[PDB]
Each structure stands twice: as structure tokens, then as C-alpha cells.
């Protein structure tokens, strides 16, 4: 509800095909080992082949997936998770330490699911990657 507190941004340097795309989405978020056998979801794979669900929409499911929450959300601290969340979708470590902290309080109020939805909504994120393109390092 309330507008985000203004945080300073540190200067940064950064500032078969179908099957591969699914793997790429999985790879950035799960770092290879996590996909395993259990983490993979049949419905998400079907939607992409089906194309009913957009890639931007596809990632949200992975971000909000139960397997992801147990592995990262539960174990890690809220502040760490905000920093942790940034690498996989944004692809960039947060420039300002204070900014990361500001994000964490918001994450707690809306939950893990709430924070992920917010990242997609932000103008910088959509513009940087695009709906069609899988998230990549910046």
C-alpha cells in the first residue's frame, strides 16, 4: 500500500529449442541440482508447449512453487531472500545494501508469493528482460 522508501542506487557495471527454453528458466532459478525429479511440474511444461501460459507467467509459477519455497524461502532470512531473489530473475545483485533491506519488510507482509508478483509488476524488470525472453544475468 504505502509507497517504497527511496533507496540510493550504487553504480554498477551491468547498468529441441522449446525444451532448452524450459531448462533455461529452470536453470537460473534452481541452479541445476534443484530441478531433480520432484521439483519439475508437468503443468508448467505443458503450458509452454501448449503456449496457453506466457513465459513471464511461467516464471511466476516457479517462483511461487512450493518446492522453491521450502528450499530458499524457509531456510534463508527475509533480507537474504530479497538479495537471493534478485539474482535469478533480475540477474543483478542489489547495488545498495539499504535498498535490499527496504524490500525485505514488504516481502514479509505480502509473503513470498507477494514479493515475486511485485518484481514482475515493476517497470524496470519487464523492460529489461521482456515476456518472451527467459531471465538472464545482467
Amino acid at each position: 500500500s504505502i509507497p517504497l522508501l527511496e533507496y540510493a542506487p550504487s553504480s554498477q557495471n551491468q547498468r529441441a529449442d522449446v525444451d532448452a527454453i524450459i531448462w533455461a528458466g529452470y536453470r537460473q532459478i534452481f541452479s541445476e541440482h534443484l530441478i531433480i525429479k520432484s521439483n519439475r511440474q508437468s503443468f508448467l511444461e505443458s503450458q509452454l508447449r501448449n503456449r496457453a501460459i506466457n513465459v513471464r507467467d511461467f516464471i511466476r509459477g516457479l517462483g511461487k512453487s512450493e518446492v522453491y519455497r521450502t528450499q530458499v524461502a524457509d531456510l534463508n532470512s527475509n533480507y537474504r531472500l530479497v538479495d537471493i531473489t534478485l539474482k535469478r530473475f533480475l540477474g543483478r545483485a542489489a547495488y545498495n545494501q539499504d535498498e535490499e533491506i527496504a524490500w525485505s519488510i514488504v516481502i514479509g507482509s505480502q509473503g513470498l508469493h507477494g514479493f515475486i508478483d511485485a518484481l514482475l509488476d515493476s517497470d524496470e524488470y519487464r523492460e529489461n528482460f521482456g515476456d518472451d525472453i527467459v531471465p538472464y544475468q545482467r
Binding site: 531433480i36 525429479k37 520432484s38 519455497r69 521450502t70 524457509d74 505480502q110 509473503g111
Partner: protein, 162 residues
């Protein structure tokens, strides 16, 4: 990790709201069944040593080649039979763990997570372990509603095997 008390929390936490009566109602349901679930834990813990060697010699019956073929994976060597009672004895631990937790969480996190990756690499056929668990669910001697209770989680490990 997955528990009906945990599942009430993680549902209400991602919404950012308090504990409603719908999360609270779920907890109430767990208690009625947790009284009969702890009955199933003592039935498996007391009969633990009978059930392990009851199982690891039942799998040798249906698969007699597993004690004969010379392979690292095979249990024909004593070292395999030492790792036989370790592996099947690991199953009754996690089944008893998921009994007292009420959920499939400890079964989901300790046993079946990444089981398709490991059985392909070491060539352990999952038809072996499902034959031991059918022996456990028929020979635990449990009765009543507690006999239903162990029978879900054993059969839940069966479906995750295949």
C-alpha cells in the same frame, strides 16, 4: 517442510493476513487423526526388527538373481546384504517419521526427493523397494484405523517409486 500446521502457516503468510478460522480449523482436524497416528508409530517401532529382516528376505524370494549376480549394485555379496538392511531400514524410519508429523513432509524431503536421479545412476531398480514395502503393509499386524494410517504413507512411497 510439509505439515498441516505448517500448511496453515505458509498459506496465511503468503497472503500477509492473520490466522483466520480457516487456517485454525485445519489444525483442529489434525488432532483427531494425530491421536490415531501415534498409535501407528508405536506399532511399527516395537515391531521394527521383525519387519526389516522380514522384508529384506522377502525381496530375495521374488528376486533370487539379486543374491547371485556379481555386481556392485547387487546384494549377493555380504556387503550388499549389509547395505540391504540399511536401505530397507531407512524406509521404516521415514515412514515412522511421517506418521508422527501427520504430513508427507519428512517422507517428501528425506526419501523421495530426487529418487529418480539416484536409482538411474546406481542402477537400483525401484521394483525392489516396492516389493519390500508391500511386505511391510501386509505384515505390520496393525489393526483398526491405525492400520489405515500406516497404509497411506507406505502406499504414498509406492506411487513415488513408480
Amino acid at each position: 517442510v510439509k505439515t498441516p500446521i505448517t500448511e496453515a502457516i505458509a498459506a496465511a503468510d503468503t497472503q500477509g493476513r492473520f490466522l483466520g478460522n480457516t487456517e485454525l480449523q485445519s489444525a483442529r482436524g489434525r488432532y483427531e487423526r494425530a491421536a490415531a497416528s501415534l498409535e501407528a508409530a508405536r506399532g511399527l517401532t516395537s515391531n521394527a526388527q521383525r519387519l526389516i529382516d522380514g522384508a529384506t528376505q522377502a525381496v530375495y524370494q521374488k528376486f533370487p538373481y539379486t543374491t547371485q549376480t556379481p555386481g556392485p549394485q547387487f546384494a549377493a555379496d555380504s556387503r550388499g546384504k549389509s547395505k540391504c538392511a540399511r536401505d530397507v531400514g531407512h524406509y521404516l524410519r521415514i515412514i515412522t517419521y511421517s506418521l508422527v508429523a501427520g504430513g508427507t513432509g519428512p517422507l517428501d524431503e528425506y526419501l523421495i526427493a530426487g529418487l529418480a536421479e539416484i536409482n538411474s545412476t546406481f542402477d537400483l531398480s525401484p521394483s525392489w523397494y516396492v516389493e519390500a514395502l508391500k511386505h511391510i503393509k501386509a505384515n505390520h499386524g496393525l489393526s483398526g484405523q491405525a492400520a489405515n494410517e500406516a497404509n497411506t504413507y507406505i502406499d504414498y512411497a509406492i506411487n513415488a517409486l513408480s
